[PDB]
Design a protein around this ligand. Structure first.
Ligand SMILES: *[C@@](C)(CO)[C@](*)(O)[C@H](CC(C)C)NC(=O)[C@H](Cc1ccccc1)NC(=O)[C@H](CC(C)C)NC(=O)[C@H](CCc1ccccc1)NC(=O)CN1CCOCC1
Ligand SMILES: [Mg+2]
Lengths: 195, 240, 244, 233, 211, 235, 222, 231
């Protein structure tokens, strides 16, 4: 999987991720969900080498779920993102590094703030209002730089996201088969079924 | 490494270390498990020798292993943490490798297997802990209640109690619990669990903990006032 | 072979008790009394040094109160050398947690970790347990101010007020009598010292025979300050509360 | 993985009616340099076996020590060490063959080609080959390196198949071996005139001949050869 | 090779070819590319024959042990995941395996694609091997959920035929399977040479080919 | 104290002999082998009426052609069963065939004496391993913690063993049918059991070539108990 | 750089009859353009009425055969002298080959014998352990020369019944042991003519319920 | 007494009591007889049953085509030691293409048993073995004790009441050694020897176990109706 976007608006974080999975010269699937719920108010999308992505995501998911049960408490998006970064920074000097880039969208219930973290496979973490991995940013960041405000509503965020996807669909050579969009806010995680 | 065989057979065919581990369980605070028609309730004794306690932060007696399974115990508190941790790890390991949450029977079988391993491994002593494991299997509305003990044997129970004065509350449950018609509602199930603990507890104040587990990961712990209302109603009916 | 000389430190008695844990607790009961009292606006840690000398350098001395991090401290009762082994482990665990999650370790998580280490020495390895009982005084943003205790068995519990070491029976009765929920730090300071003054085996309670510490939100705005009292400061608070 | 440094060239051998013959020159080459002229590459094991080795000389000396130790070890707690439970050619070979294959399987071979020639308890002739890869084969005639290309054709004219063995005498077989060694001296750039020859007969036992020389060589016709085509003087 | 599998109203169809190649040389005219793991579980094979046979036969051991421990058949989802986890141990060591785990369990019919990278995908239709592109063409244009067992068996059979014809490394014969809730059902070995001529005449397809 | 692998002056391993005493305290298990199949039956012995008896699993499937009953410290049997199941399936992986009942039993018994100062003590449980293969037909083995295994035509282990074994001595003959064997296990179990035998506190099972290993339903066993009562009242 | 592999040439052929089986192979051993031996046995009697030949790299072939022979020995020890069936031997060999998935036995292996119903059986293995039961199979250097001939003359491929013109196939009538040996000899004689690594001699091992019999035939030595 | 708690302890008179107690386990075991001529070597073993429903415990184990043993004592220990012999016989064949000499097989068993008598934690083997074989120096019979002592003999017997059979063989020494090229007569002498150790019970069809190895005879075991000929 190649394409993953993220945008943090006033009261939520929105993650958009492509649906395509390719094998050799054939597209095997056009409805693949490149995301895992780490906790009720934390969602992680991912992109990178085949196999490694899901493994890493599920491994992180298992660790956060274990923590949640042990402490009867949900870790902050910041705490989760730091754990994820360390695992990747640990990984890059391994015999075989996991080649996975992630976006972590979460709503901090303590601070009542949405938070978006971008982490690449090297363990390079940055908190952003909007982010992307791979070539996605090359096409979309100019639009986001122009249109983005921090006081945007969730509906305005989705409209700006549609504009980003339209630009990708126009100028990218690859057909990524559209995106699955998910929203993370105070009430938890939900999927936008029509996009 | 320290390899000494601590759990060994005696001339009369007994493993004393395993039997002395049961004596530690006998010393522990009373724990009780009762399953109704659509729920399971876990009751636990809190000894009132310890006041000035901070009840917010003090380790609670009932522990969630997953969102749909709970574990209570009687015996050594420190030993119980090791079993709970292992169980919690195995629960996530099962979800990760098989893509289904553990069944209550499987989780019990794992915890029982850990206890057994510590009865024939060198350098280690048995866990001084007996557990009550309860919950509902994924996409199933049949209640599950299991018991384990230091030897590593486990079995399913309609209702069971462990710990100090468990002999008395088991006596109560055996005459009060009908298999043909179990506690139909949550109220009836909690009432029967509180009644059973009132045979042993002393005061019905902060000495009784109740945790109700319903199907589909619906687990809640009752508060002091909610339990106190059951304590009030039971004795008012008793004055007759 | 070697079996002949093995004491077997990790076995049950016929009554279902751990011999070495019980005997370690017997050792701790002769150690200097340490008291912890939790208030709404802070925590107090008071402790009695054991029969000191006039030639002991007190201002550079530390046998009872130790700092685990900026938010958490411990009072010790038992073998000091054993406690320092555990204290350094606890300090490392707090830093590991901070490095991993970029947040200060919650008090209970640190307590559980140390208590699990103590537990391990009672179940495997064939080594003697640590002859130490801790009182943990700490703060985090989840539960606020917290008091815990751990003993050689590896069992830990939370408290509003608690004592360890010598004369805990007498001390716990006195605390249970005068403690109230709406209590404040300055009142708790007074209660801690009054309790030690009555339970002490010494003729009188003086500044040179005490270690004292507070954890206060009495730090400029929303943050927490640890105060390890100096000898002169302990002398002043003894006069203030009217003990000397 | 290595490369051979000091090397030994062809080892040649053949069966005859009552036993086997084996031969090898006394040279230890260092690339194109004919460095060591007094090297023995035929190593007897008891009075019934001779191991001829080509390839890396340091690895040869290692094998030589393994065999020396093998004899020592067989004598341990063995009253019949010089009789029924003495070392057989087939035992010695299979041991080496096991070692050679194990070493190649660890990617650290003994850079050699070995021919074990001997006579068994029951009088049967033994002649088998093994190399750095652990590859083994048996034939009425065996030769390593250049011997495989030049000596075998000559020796196979004497013993072309199994039925020719009883018809071949020791005088004929030795004559063929000695001629083959002369041909190798003419044509192999890493060969020497001096060589050793060993005969293992089921009747007369082990005969080990040292300090042999290639003789009866033809060189006279060289005087008539002038230039490379058109030159007359 | 060419393999395919798809879910439909009456379970799942599984069709494979039988050719095996060692370069341009056809080493085998009839290789079994389906493994029978249990009466309700099948596994297709594409890539290295040895890898496909070993790891899927090792899956069957592990799926069998599941039944003994739990007294219950393993799900298709869990079986596919065990296999993907095996592939993940020999990550980058050079294994070549592409398989579809087809079966019926409590959730109904199940179909999972698994390969050497560790990829594990759920889906209604899959096709693997050198001839998958040809098979997808026929499948995508003719597939429906409302297919009859007779028509569905034909579709999978016809799809392999399309690939066997065009792809040089696909052919030999067609092996058909139909998975129901009572288990899988073998629907025979069909020589492509004979099947081709038959389909040509009856269907009217392959007009460009002379016969 | 003393070594775990110590010999007594009589030439027996103390620990092995003591584990045999633990097995005598266990609930009764009986096995009978016939030419129509092997029958395995056990006493459940619930410690309380609130204990759901159907959760008491003292008869266990190792493979489709091999079953197993246990007596003694039943918790110790779990790792033995796990090993047996692994051995049975692993052999099927390596050799594409069913494993011989004797070979399976031998594999289980190889664990027995792997104790010292490996596990810290012998197993405190005996096993009746019953099965069928093509070479030796229907078989019944008794696997002890000594590492020894005997084949039996019929065998009883547990607390009522010597009383049951004497009864099996008289009753067994080479022409027993499966139905006759079923009733015979029920009869002897009912004789040695403390509580009154019924479908809830006793369990039957069998292994046949056709249908393989099967644990009997409580409804099926109940009918065999009723059939037993009537035939005993018949004379 | 050290190359742990080599090519010793050779060609093998296994054919399954109705109640018999043959495993044939030439006796020539080679490296590059040299002949090592004109008679080096390549097909072995492994016991329990099974014959094997591991063609390709001789050192790996000898090692594998040696290990399987050993596997048969221990199968008797461990399972009460039970006879190792041909299907069980095949699966055992798969696991022997895959133990070196990452440093393979560079050999093409064939075994022959009788199944548990008494019918003829041949199994074929790739170097990394993929096996399959077959009726007919040639392996090694001249495998591509021989197999098409066996498709035509054993399974009657592309052969139809005269008069019908492609409508009716030639019926698949069973072959006798004498008929099979003729096809084997003609296969190797033809292969010897056009392949330089094939020649010297041909050794055939025939397996029936009565046991294992050998037959040897000369081949051209050029 | 105070010096029998483990194998690592000498008594004041220089005795190893744990080894002596292991030796006692052999005396409790059922009788087995070994004897040989110059061409063949024979094992005869009285098998023991638990009861009438039980089978008769097997006593003879094959190690190679040319070697095998009979046991008396702890059967699992015989399985461990016979497995070791199987491997050693097999190592000799695979590496050296050489059948393992019976004398050397005895030396290997001796050294394996010895290590268990000098180290703490372990225990001595609780079984006695009679190894027969035919190698390059003809027929052989060995007696193995778990003390480590291995002895080459013409004939012997171990187990309960083994003294009766041993005396018989000591009388018959000059006769049975000469039984060359006659396997049936050598077995007869063995069956007659083991009969001197019987009381109350006699040799039945499922009671008797016989094994033989020789010049042109692979190690083969006879049980059931195959030994009815010799009853
Ligand atoms: C279609 C037909 C092609 O994609 C299918 O995918 C089939 C499916 C399998 C189940 C049959 N795929 C193959 O047949 C597969 C193609 C392939 C091979 C390798 C990697 C990826 C795909 N073919 C094989 O696995 C063949 C099958 C044999 C005939 C049973 N095997 C080989 O090619 C082997 C293994 C590779 C190898 C191992 C060790 C050393 C060298 C190569 N190769 C050979 O046997 C080559 N052999 C070398 C010696 O001289 C003779 C040829
Ligand atoms: Mg980045």
């Amino acid at each position: 999987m190649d394409i993953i976007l993220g945008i943090r608006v006033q009261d939520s974080v929105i993650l958009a991720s492509s649906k395509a999975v390719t094998r050799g010269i054939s597209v095997l699937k056009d409805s693949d969900d490149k995301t895992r719920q780490l906790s009720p108010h934390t969602l992680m999308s991912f992109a990178g080498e085949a196999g490694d992505t899901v493994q890493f995501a599920e491994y992180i998911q298992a660790n956060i779920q274990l923590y949640s049960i042990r402490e009867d408490y949900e870790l902050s998006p910041q705490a989760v993102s730091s754990f994820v970064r360390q695992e990747l920074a640990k990984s890059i000097r391994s015999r075989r590094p996991y080649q996975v880039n992630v976006l972590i969208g979460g709503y901090d219930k303590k601070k009542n703030k949405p938070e978006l973290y971008q982490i690449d496979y090297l363990g390079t973490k940055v908190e952003l209002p909007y982010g992307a991995h791979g070539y996605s940013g090359f096409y979309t960041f100019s639009l986001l730089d122009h249109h983005y405000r921090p006081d945007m509503t969730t509906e305005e965020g989705l409209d700006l996201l549609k504009l980003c996807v339209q630009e990708l669909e126009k100028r990218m050579p690859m057909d990524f088969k559209g995106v699955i969009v998910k929203i993370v806010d105070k009430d938890g995680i939900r999927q936008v079924d029509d996009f | 490494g320290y390899d000494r065989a601590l759990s060994i057979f005696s001339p009369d065919g007994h493993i004393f270390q395993v039997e002395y581990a049961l004596e530690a369980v006998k010393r522990g605070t009373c724990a009780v498990g009762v399953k109704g028609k659509n729920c399971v309730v876990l009751g636990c004794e809190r000894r009132s020798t310890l006041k000035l306690q901070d009840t917010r932060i003090t380790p609670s007696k009932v522990s969630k292993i997953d969102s749909h399974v709970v574990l209570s115990f009687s015996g050594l508190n420190a030993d119980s943490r090791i079993l709970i941790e292992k169980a919690r790890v195995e629960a996530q390991s099962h979800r990760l490798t098989l893509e289904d949450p553990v069944t209550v029977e499987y989780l019990t079988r794992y915890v029982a297997g850990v206890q057994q391993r510590y009865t024939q491994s060198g350098g280690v002593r048995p866990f001084g802990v007996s557990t009550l494991i309860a919950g509902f299997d994924p996409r199933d509305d049949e209640p599950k209640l299991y018991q384990t003990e230091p030897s590593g044997i486990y079995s399913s129970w309609s209702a069971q109690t462990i710990g100090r004065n468990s002999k008395t509350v088991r006596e109560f449950l055996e005459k009060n619990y009908d298999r043909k018609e179990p506690p139909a509602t949550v109220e009836e199930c909690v009432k029967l669990t509180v009644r059973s603990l009132l045979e042993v507890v002393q005061t019905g104040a902060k000495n009784i903990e109740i945790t109700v587990v319903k199907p589909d990961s619906d687990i809640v712990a009752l508060s002091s006032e909610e339990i106190n209302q059951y304590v009030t109603q039971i004795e008012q009916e008793k004055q007759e | 072979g070697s079996r002949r000389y093995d004491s077997r430190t990790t076995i049950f008695s016929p009554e279902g008790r751990l011999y070495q844990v019980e005997y370690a607790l017997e050792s701790i009961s002769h150690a200097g009394t340490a008291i912890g009292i939790m208030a709404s606006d802070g925590i107090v840690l008071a402790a009695e040094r054991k029969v000191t000398s006039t030639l002991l350098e007190q201002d550079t001395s530390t046998e009872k109160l130790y700092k685990l991090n900026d938010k958490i401290a411990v009072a010790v009762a038992g073998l000091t050398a054993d406690a320092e082994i555990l204290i350094n482990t606890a300090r490392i665990h707090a830093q590991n947690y901070l490095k991993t999650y970029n947040e200060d370790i919650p008090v209970e998580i640190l307590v559980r970790r140390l208590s699990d280490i103590k537990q391990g020495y009672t179940q495997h390895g064939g080594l003697r347990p640590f002859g130490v009982s801790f009182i943990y005084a700490g703060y985090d943003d989840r539960y606020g101010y917290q008091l815990y205790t751990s003993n050689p068995s590896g069992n830990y519990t939370g408290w509003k007020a608690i004592s360890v070491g010598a004369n805990t029976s007498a001390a716990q009765t006195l605390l249970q009598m005068d403690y109230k929920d709406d209590m404040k730090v300055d009142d708790a300071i007074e209660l801690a010292l009054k309790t030690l003054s009555k339970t002490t085996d010494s003729s009188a309670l003086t500044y040179d025979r005490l270690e004292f510490a507070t954890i206060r939100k009495g730090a400029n705005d929303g943050e927490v300050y640890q105060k390890i009292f100096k000898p002169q400061e302990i002398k002043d608070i003894l006069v203030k509360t009217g003990i000397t | 993985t290595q490369q051979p440094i000091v090397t030994g060239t062809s080892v040649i051998s053949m069966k005859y009616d009552n036993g086997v013959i084996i031969a090898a020159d006394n040279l230890g080459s260092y690339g194109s340099l004919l460095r060591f002229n007094g090297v023995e590459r035929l190593i007897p094991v008891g009075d019934n076996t001779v191991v001829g080795i080509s390839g890396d000389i340091s690895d040869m000396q290692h094998i030589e020590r393994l065999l020396k130790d093998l004899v020592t070890e067989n004598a341990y707690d063995n009253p019949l060490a010089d009789a029924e439970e003495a070392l057989e050619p087939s035992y010695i070979f299979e041991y080496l063959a096991t070692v050679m294959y194990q070493r190649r399987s660890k990617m650290n071979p003994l850079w050699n080609a070995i021919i074990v020639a001997g006579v068994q308890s029951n009088g049967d002739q033994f002649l088998r080959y093994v190399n750095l890869l652990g590859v083994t084969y048996s034939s009425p005639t065996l030769a390593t390196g250049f011997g495989a290309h030049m000596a075998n054709p000559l020796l196979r004219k004497v013993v072309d198949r199994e039925s020719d063995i009883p018809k071949t005498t020791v005088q004929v077989a030795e004559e063929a071996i000695v001629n083959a060694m002369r041909v190798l001296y003419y044509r192999d750039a890493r060969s020497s005139r001096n060589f050793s020859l060993a005969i293992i007969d089921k009747n007369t036992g082990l005969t080990f001949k040292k300090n042999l020389q290639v003789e009866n060589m033809k060189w006279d016709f060289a005087k008539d050869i002038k230039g490379y085509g058109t030159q007359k003087i | 090779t060419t393999t395919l599998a798809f879910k439909f109203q009456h379970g799942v169809i599984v069709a494979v070819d039988s050719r095996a190649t060692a370069g341009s040389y056809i080493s085998s005219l009839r290789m079994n590319k389906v493994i029978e793991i249990n009466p309700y579980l099948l596994g297709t094979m594409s890539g290295c024959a040895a890898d496909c046979q070993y790891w899927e036969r090792l899956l069957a051991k592990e799926c069998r042990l599941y039944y003994l421990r739990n007294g219950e058949r393993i799900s298709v989802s869990a079986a596919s995941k065990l296999l993907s986890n095996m592939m993940l141990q020999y990550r980058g060591m050079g294994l070549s395996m592409g398989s579809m785990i087809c079966g019926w369990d409590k959730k109904g019919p199940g179909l999972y694609y698994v390969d050497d990278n560790g990829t594990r995908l759920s889906g209604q239709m899959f096709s693997t091997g050198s001839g998958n592109t040809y098979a997808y063409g026929v499948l995508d244009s003719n597939y429906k959920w409302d297919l009859s067992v007779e028509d569905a068996l034909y579709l999978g059979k016809r799809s392999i035929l399309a690939a066997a014809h065009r792809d040089a490394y696909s052919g030999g014969s067609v092996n058909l399977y139909h998975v129901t809730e009572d288990g899988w059902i073998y629907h025979g070995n069909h020589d492509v040479g004979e099947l081709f001529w038959k389909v040509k005449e009856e269907e009217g397809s392959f007009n460009n080919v002379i016969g | 104290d003393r070594g775990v692998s110590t010999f007594s002056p009589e030439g027996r391993l103390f620990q092995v002999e003591y584990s045999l005493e633990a097995i005598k305290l266990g609930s009764t298990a009986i096995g009978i082998a016939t030419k129509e199949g092997v029958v395995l039956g056990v006493e459940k012995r619930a410690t309380s009426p609130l204990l759901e008896s159907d959760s008491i699993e003292k008869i266990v499937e190792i493979d489709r052609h091999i079953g197993c009953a246990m007596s003694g410290l039943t918790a110790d049997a779990r790792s033995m069963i796990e090993h047996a199941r692994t051995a049975a399936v692993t052999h099927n992986l390596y050799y594409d065939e069913d494993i011989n009942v004797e070979s399976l039993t031998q594999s289980v018994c190889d664990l027995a004496l792997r104790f010292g100062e490996l596990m810290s003590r012998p197993f405190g449980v005996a096993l009746l391993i019953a099965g069928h293969d093509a070479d030796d037909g229907y078989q019944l083995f008794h696997a002890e913690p000594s590492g020894t295994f005997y084949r039996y035509n019929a065998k009883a282990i547990g607390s009522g063993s010597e009383g049951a074994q004497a009864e099996l001595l008289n009753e067994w003959h080479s022409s027993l049918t499966l139905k006759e064997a079923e009733l015979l296990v029920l009869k002897i179990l009912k004789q040695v059991m403390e509580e009154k035998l019924d479908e809830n506190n006793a369990q039957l099972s069998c292994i046949t070539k056709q249908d393989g290993f099967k644990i009997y339903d409580n409804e099926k066993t109940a009918e065999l108990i009723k059939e037993l009562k009537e035939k005993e009242a018949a004379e | 750089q050290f190359n742990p592999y080599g090519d010793n040439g050779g060609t093998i052929l296994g054919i399954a009859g109705e109640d018999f089986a043959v495993l044939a192979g030439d006796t020539r051993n080679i490296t590059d353009y040299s002949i090592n031996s004109r008679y080096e046995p390549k097909v072995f009697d492994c016991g329990d009425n099974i014959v094997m030949s591991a063609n390709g790299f001789a050192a790996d072939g000898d090692a594998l055969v040696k290990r399987f022979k050993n596997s048969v020995k221990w199968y008797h020890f461990d399972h009460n002298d039970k006879k190792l069936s041909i299907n069980s031997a095949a699966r055992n060999i798969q696991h022997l080959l895959y133990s070196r998935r990452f440093f393979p036995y560079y050999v093409y292996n064939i075994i022959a014998g009788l199944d548990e119903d008494g019918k003829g059986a041949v199994y074929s293995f790739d170097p990394v352990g993929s096996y399959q039961r077959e009726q007919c199979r040639a392996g090694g250097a001249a495998a591509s020369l021989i197999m098409p001939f066996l498709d035509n003359q054993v399974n009657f491929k592309n052969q139809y019944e005269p008069g019908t013109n492609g409508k009716v196939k030639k019926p698949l009538k069973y072959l006798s042991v004498e008929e099979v040996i003729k096809l084997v000899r003609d296969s190797f004689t033809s292969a010897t003519e056009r392949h330089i690594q094939v020649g010297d001699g041909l050794e055939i091992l025939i397996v029936t319920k009565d046991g294992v019999r050998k037959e040897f035939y000369e081949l051209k030595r050029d | 007494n105070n010096y029998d708690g483990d194998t690592v302890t000498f008594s004041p008179t220089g005795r190893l009591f744990q080894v002596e107690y292991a030796l006692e386990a052999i005396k409790q075991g059922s009788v087995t007889v070994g004897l040989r001529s110059n061409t063949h070597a024979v094992l005869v073993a009285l098998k023991r049953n638990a009861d009438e429903l039980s089978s008769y415990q097997k006593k003879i184990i094959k190690c190679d085509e040319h070697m095998g043993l009979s046991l008396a004592g702890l059967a699992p220990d015989a399985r461990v030691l016979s497995n070791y012999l199987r491997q050693q016989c097999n190592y000799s064949s695979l590496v050296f293409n050489r059948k393992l000499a019976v004398e050397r097989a005895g030396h290997l068993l001796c050294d394996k048993a010895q290590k268990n008598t000098q180290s703490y934690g372990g225990r001595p083997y609780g079984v006695g073995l009679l190894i027969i074989g035919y190698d390059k120096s003809g027929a052989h019979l060995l007696e193995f004790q778990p003390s480590g002592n291995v002895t080459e003999l013409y004939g012997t017997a171990i187990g309960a009441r083994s003294q009766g059979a041993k005396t018989y063989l000591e009388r018959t020494l000059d006769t049975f050694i000469k039984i060359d090229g006659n396997p049936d007569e050598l077995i007869k002498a063995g069956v007659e020897a083991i009969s001197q150790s019987l009381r109350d019970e006699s040799l039945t069809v499922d009671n008797l176990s016989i094994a033989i190895v020789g010049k042109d005879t692979p190690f083969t075991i006879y049980d059931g109706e195959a030994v009815a000929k010799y009853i």
